[PDB]
Design a protein around this ligand. Structure first.
Ligand SMILES: *[C@@H]1O[C@H](CO)[C@@H](O[C@@H]2O[C@H](CO)[C@@H](O[C@@H]3O[C@H](CO)[C@@H](O)[C@H](O)[C@@H]3O)[C@H](O)[C@H]2NC(C)=O)[C@H](O)[C@H]1NC(C)=O
Ligand SMILES: *[C@@H]1O[C@H](CO)[C@@H](O[C@@H]2O[C@H](CO)[C@@H](O)[C@H](O)[C@H]2NC(C)=O)[C@H](O)[C@H]1NC(C)=O
Ligand SMILES: *[C@@H]1O[C@H](CO)[C@@H](O[C@@H]2O[C@H](CO)[C@@H](O)[C@H](O)[C@H]2NC(C)=O)[C@H](O)[C@H]1NC(C)=O
Ligand SMILES: *[C@@H]1O[C@H](CO)[C@@H](O[C@@H]2O[C@H](CO)[C@@H](O)[C@H](O)[C@H]2NC(C)=O)[C@H](O)[C@H]1NC(C)=O
Ligand SMILES: *[C@@H]1O[C@H](CO)[C@@H](O[C@@H]2O[C@H](CO)[C@@H](O)[C@H](O)[C@H]2NC(C)=O)[C@H](O)[C@H]1NC(C)=O
Ligand SMILES: *[C@@H]1O[C@H](CO)[C@@H](O[C@@H]2O[C@H](CO)[C@@H](O)[C@H](O)[C@H]2NC(C)=O)[C@H](O)[C@H]1NC(C)=O
Ligand SMILES: *[C@@H]1O[C@H](CO)[C@@H](O[C@@H]2O[C@H](CO)[C@@H](O)[C@H](O)[C@H]2NC(C)=O)[C@H](O)[C@H]1NC(C)=O
Ligand SMILES: CC(=O)N[C@@H]1[C@@H](O)[C@H](O)[C@@H](CO)O[C@H]1O
Ligand SMILES: *[C@@H]1O[C@H](CO)[C@@H](O)[C@H](O)[C@H]1NC(C)=O
Ligand SMILES: *[C@@H]1O[C@H](CO)[C@@H](O)[C@H](O)[C@H]1NC(C)=O
Ligand SMILES: *[C@@H]1O[C@H](CO)[C@@H](O)[C@H](O)[C@H]1NC(C)=O
Ligand SMILES: *[C@@H]1O[C@H](CO)[C@@H](O)[C@H](O)[C@H]1NC(C)=O
Ligand SMILES: *[C@@H]1O[C@H](CO)[C@@H](O)[C@H](O)[C@H]1NC(C)=O
Lengths: 99, 238, 366, 35, 86, 49, 50, 34, 50
């Protein structure tokens, strides 16, 4: 009841997930080499024959960011699953019997 | 129609600290209870601010002007390079009524002055106004700490202002307050110097500082009012 | 749909995901401050006298309602070349502090008015910055600025010590010494007047008939724009998924009344990660809130093609208020996971067969 | 070296040897009760 | 990456099938979380209840036993854990 | 990737915060290595002789 | 034009660095698993009989 | 102070030996007292 | 002699042979040069960083 910072692991897992989501959603505000960071502006400001190039740059940048996020999520999920297996083994052994 | 002066009065150039003053809203966006980091032109924390008790001083990138004014003696400012009819000049005045902003090739003499007569009527700061460009009139700007920030970027003249009641005598207050935006002028000039306007008794203590480009962190409360800030390039803790 | 997505003619018992759905916008709304002054173009396009190229006339235009259709449809313009934006779209934007420059040049010199171009006028009278954005207009004035005796009132610079920086004006008329002897303001050998005059005659062929040229320079995103286009303001609907064009800032969503307290100099705000959420309409000066239109994936619950053929449909994270042939169907149930249609709720509690979520799931009987 | 660096381990080899020696002495002398 | 734009969707379409497998992974992750929780906790076949009288040889288990008074049906330590972490 | 070039840095900074998250992983790896060693060897409370 | 050349160099080097980081992450995870196995082996087969 | 890990400034070293609060490296670390 | 770069220069005892003008170790990283005025061998190492 009294001591603080007694639940570091759950708090840091939640913080890591929140930070990953935050940086992923923050990555949408970059030019990636194009003339603007928002799609509607370039759609409504000029002729398609260049809008295709701008959209191509946006697409490749956003695809790279999404792939990086997915890979990080997969790694963290694997680690969490291993921890859950260890917890299940401990529950089965040290509760339903004497170790 | 302006004359020289006999007494070449000397205003001692004192130096003192800035503490945590010189912060202004940088944009037009409302944010609530959030920490935001931005890089722009600001006055560095704990800098050296100059104190005068109207010599020509450079404008540089931007200026910050503070007055512990009583009775509102100061009337306005002058902006330009050579301060003559040869070069386009800017002149801001705030008399008892609405302010006047003029953009003309004014002919400036040594000491412009407005005078007060003991029924307020006198204006002979300059002599001739040949070619005028812009004219602006709005509400008047004016113990009483008045803080102003002047910037000129890409042909835009930005002015920020803040008014405060104060009771301390000499030292700059050790508090925090953000200068709300006041006006923007869409006129492009190559200003490099500036003056001060005094209405002498025809019957001077203020602080000045410069700006530098650097990064700051601002805190927005639940009501969207800036309440605290941190300067990056100040300390390892910063 | 389940069979198509699963790519098989038989389907095993369980829950499957097929596609997504969204709430499409219904109508559009635009809000602009009621400013109706007509932006002056006749005084600069249909003007009588045009200044010479070495003294190009520059005017700053701001805070006006301008139409570009009248410029675009007219066939009197020989050259109509816009650089920063597509022409047909100038009616769909808003700016401030626009610049218009006007002069008259020789017929052959119209090609010299282009970014990154070199010549005689291009580097001695008028220079276009390499990052120029805007548009250029040129048309014919053979029958307006040519006399039988010839017009000699139009001039241009011919000599200078060096080039000219972009967007500069030179008016000085000083004797230019091309030799190695001071001239002392005496026009003689190797001492030429810097200016020269045109010989516009009605018999002159093309490339010599005078042309009138006006260039328009725009800006993008320096301040709240005031030079808008010909837009008709509309009313304000609420609590519906629509798209909006608030003073040029566009987007789709649902608008609701807000209790947020602004400060007298903002127009809009955002919460985090550059996600605008609050706006202030120019007309009423009222603060609103924007919420993204509803969306979500759909799921099909089946007991197996081997047994029966009746299925249930689940919409994830969607309030049972705007679902839409399966709009009403059977008894519609609302769950913490969304809305489920095609199954009957009971007050029993059995072993879970096909997990659904939030502690509830379905089974077969119906 | 063109932007890559190597950091040193927190525990030197000497303390690792000390831990190994302490464990070995404890298991020889006290058996397993010290665990 | 498109935000309800037909042109962006059409331009993306000619990149083959990347987002099918991109979307096929998060669902698997969620299913792994669900099965992890289910296999960790579902270790018994029947729900047991303590007798109403509690005389456990002098040991006092009131701290860990669930509290029927609280609507959450949670023990004291469980509530402390639920409240401490933000 | 830049080798002390101002133009390279200016071009790079428009790509977003790739490098912050790139550097945020190696530090975690190093801390994990240190924790691994500490938890695999520091299993006693008193140094015996 | 140096802008375009530097763009090419930047994208290539960034992709290579990303690949290296991913490989390092995988190897670190495997090493951590091995370290956990070693730790439990030493805890069980040294401080007592197994 | 100069250490195998580099150079440390703003701190004063002692000749005692305590538990580790903030690990530094090369078998040494710091704590608060200054 | 047209080869530019930053670093710190020290006297070196590496043994060139009269036709070499510079020497690199690995990954085309130049390490030694022979100045035209003195025809002596030097060593270049990068300035410290961290
Ligand atoms: C400069 O002056 C010329 C000459 O007046 C202007 O051209 C004329 O402009 C008027 C007003 O826009 C046009 O009248 C309208 O024409 C449309 C299309 O035919 C018609 O549907 C309307 O009912 C109305 O009659 C006129 O056609 C047009 N041309 C001529 C030969 O008169 C020009 O617009 C002026 N430009 C500027 C910038 O002031
Ligand atoms: C803005 O004004 C300043 C001076 O008020 C100009 O600086 C001068 O530039 C010339 C040309 O190199 C020098 O010979 C002078 O010595 C400079 N004077 C000072 C005080 O610096 C500057 O060139 C002007 N800028 C523009 C764009 O007109
Ligand atoms: C202000 O503008 C006026 C415009 O008339 C300038 O006055 C002209 O100056 C030229 C210079 O050679 C004279 O030839 C004209 O006779 C003047 N016209 C007049 C006086 O009506 C005046 O020079 C400009 N101001 C400055 C400081 O240059
Ligand atoms: C203060 O300055 C203004 C500058 O325009 C003086 O001019 C009057 O301003 C008021 C306010 O708009 C007008 O209604 C008058 O018509 C202006 N008069 C003139 C002659 O221009 C104003 O007189 C000044 N007030 C003082 C000195 O008390
Ligand atoms: C921020 O805004 C809130 C909401 O307007 C303010 O809370 C109210 O403030 C007024 C002014 O003193 C009080 O009369 C009300 O009783 C307050 N409402 C409450 C307490 O629910 C608040 O004062 C503003 N400032 C800060 C720093 O929060
Ligand atoms: C689905 O939408 C309806 C309609 O808005 C919601 O009903 C509202 O609920 C709020 C919160 O209790 C009340 O303040 C409103 O008065 C209700 N309006 C109506 C017309 O019923 C309903 O709560 C929503 N469902 C969920 C699960 O959020
Ligand atoms: C088990 O312990 C709890 C608390 O440690 C005991 O409950 C307390 O009982 C006393 C006397 O009746 C009260 O004054 C306290 O307020 C109670 N505290 C709580 C948290 O309930 C309980 O009586 C003990 N049980 C036995 C059998 O000894
Ligand atoms: C015997 C011995 O080691 N004495 C040390 C000395 O070497 C050291 O210089 C000094 C300052 O730390 O502290 C003491
Ligand atoms: C300003 O500079 C003077 C020396 O010119 C110095 O004595 C004074 O302390 C400084 N004030 C500050 C840094 O606040
Ligand atoms: C809209 O027009 C009416 C007409 O009187 C005006 O009262 C109102 O102020 C206008 N709205 C604006 C300018 O936002
Ligand atoms: C399931 O299908 C098999 C053959 O596909 C059939 O033999 C069996 O009877 C079916 N079971 C049910 C319950 O329909
Ligand atoms: C059974 O569930 C239905 C909902 O379909 C509800 O209307 C009814 O009151 C419930 N009856 C009992 C006895 O719980
Ligand atoms: C010129 O260079 C040669 C070869 O490097 C050298 O031998 C000679 O001394 C140099 N002379 C001068 C004056 O530097």
């Amino acid at each position: 009841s009294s001591t603080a910072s007694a639940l570091g692991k759950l708090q840091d897992v939640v913080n890591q997930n929140a930070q990953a989501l935050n940086t992923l959603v923050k990555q949408l505000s970059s030019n990636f080499g194009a003339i603007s960071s928002v799609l509607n502006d370039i759609l409504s400001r000029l002729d398609p024959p260049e809008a295709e190039v701008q959209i191509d740059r946006l697409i490749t940048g956003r695809l790279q960011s999404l792939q990086t996020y997915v890979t990080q999520q997969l790694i963290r999920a694997a680690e969490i699953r291993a921890s859950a297996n260890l917890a299940a083994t401990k529950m089965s052994e040290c509760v339903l019997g004497q170790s | 129609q302006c004359v020289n002066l006999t007494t070449r009065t000397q205003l001692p150039p004192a130096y003192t600290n800035s503490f945590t003053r010189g912060v202004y809203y940088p944009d037009k966006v409302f944010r609530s209870s959030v920490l935001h980091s931005t890089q722009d032109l600001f006055l560095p924390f704990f800098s050296n601010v100059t104190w005068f008790h109207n010599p020509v001083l450079p404008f540089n990138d931007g200026v910050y002007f503070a007055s512990t004014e009583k009775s509102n003696i100061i009337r306005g400012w002058i902006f330009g390079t050579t301060l003559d009819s040869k070069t386009q000049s800017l002149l801001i005045v705030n008399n008892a009524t609405n302010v006047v902003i003029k953009v003309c090739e004014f002919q400036f003499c040594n000491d412009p002055f407005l005078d007060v007569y003991y029924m307020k009527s006198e204006f002979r700061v300059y002599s001739s106004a040949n070619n005028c460009t812009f004219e602006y009139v709005s509400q008047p700007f004016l113990k009483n700490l008045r803080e102003f920030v002047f910037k000129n970027i890409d042909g835009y003249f930005k002015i920020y202002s803040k008014h405060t009641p104060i009771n301390l005598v000499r030292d700059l207050p050790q508090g925090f307050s953000a200068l709300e935006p006041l006006v923007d002028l869409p006129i492009g000039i190559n200003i490099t110097r500036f003056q001060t306007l005094l209405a002498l008794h025809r019957s001077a203590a203020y602080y000045v500082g410069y700006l530098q480009p650097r990064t700051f962190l601002l805190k927005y409360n639940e009501n969207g009012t800036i309440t605290d800030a941190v300067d990056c390039a100040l300390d390892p803790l910063s | 749909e389940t069979k198509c997505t699963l790519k098989s003619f038989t389907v095993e018992k369980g829950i499957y995901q097929t596609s997504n759905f969204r709430v499409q916008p219904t109508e559009s709304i635009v809000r602009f401050p009621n400013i109706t002054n007509l932006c002056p173009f006749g005084e600069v396009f249909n003007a009588t006298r045009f200044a010479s190229v070495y003294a190009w006339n520059r005017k700053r235009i701001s805070n006006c309602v301008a139409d570009y259709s009248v410029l675009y449809n007219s066939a009197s313009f020989s050259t109509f070349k816009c650089y920063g934006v597509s022409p047909t779209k100038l009616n769909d934007l808003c700016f401030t502090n626009v610049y218009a420059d006007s002069f008259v040049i020789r017929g052959d010199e119209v090609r010299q008015i282009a970014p990154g171009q070199t010549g005689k006028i291009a580097d001695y009278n008028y220079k276009l910055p390499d990052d120029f954005t805007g548009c250029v207009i040129a048309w014919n004035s053979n029958n307006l600025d040519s006399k039988v005796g010839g017009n000699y009132n139009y001039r241009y610079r011919l000599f200078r010590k060096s080039n000219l920086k972009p967007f500069e004006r030179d008016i000085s008329t000083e004797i230019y010494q091309a030799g190695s002897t001071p001239c002392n303001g005496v026009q003689g050998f190797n001492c030429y007047f810097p200016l020269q005059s045109y010989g516009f005659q009605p018999t002159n062929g093309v490339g010599y008939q005078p042309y009138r040229v006006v260039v328009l320079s725009f800006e993008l995103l320096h301040a709240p724009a005031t030079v808008c286009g010909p837009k008709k303001s509309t009313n304000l609907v609420k609590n519906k998924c629509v798209n909006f064009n608030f003073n040029g800032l566009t987007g789709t969503g649902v608008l609701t009344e807000s209790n947020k307290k602004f400060l007298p100099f903002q127009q809009f705000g955002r919460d985090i990660a550059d996600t605008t959420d609050a706006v202030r309409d120019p007309q009423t000066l009222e603060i609103l809130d924007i919420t993204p239109c509803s969306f979500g994936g759909v799921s099909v619950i089946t007991p197996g093609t081997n047994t029966s053929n009746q299925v249930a449909v689940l919409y994830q994270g969607v309030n049972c208020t705007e679902v839409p042939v399966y709009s009403t169907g059977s008894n519609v149930f609302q769950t913490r996971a969304g809305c489920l249609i095609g199954a009957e709720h009971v007050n029993n509690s059995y072993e879970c067969d096909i997990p659904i979520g939030a502690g509830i799931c379905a089974s077969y009987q119906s | 070296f063109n932007g890559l660096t190597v950091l040193p381990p927190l525990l030197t080899d000497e303390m690792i040897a000390q831990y190994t020696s302490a464990l070995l002495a404890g298991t020889i002398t006290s058996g397993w009760t010290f665990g | 990456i498109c935000g309800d734009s037909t042109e962006c969707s059409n331009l993306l379409l000619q990149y083959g099938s990347f987002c099918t497998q991109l979307n096929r992974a998060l669902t698997g992750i969620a299913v792994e979380q669900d099965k992890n929780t289910q296999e960790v906790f579902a270790q018994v076949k029947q729900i047991y209840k303590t007798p109403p009288i509690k005389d456990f040889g002098g040991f006092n288990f009131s701290q860990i036993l669930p509290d029927p008074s609280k609507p959450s049906k949670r023990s004291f330590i469980e509530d402390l854990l639920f409240n401490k972490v933000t």
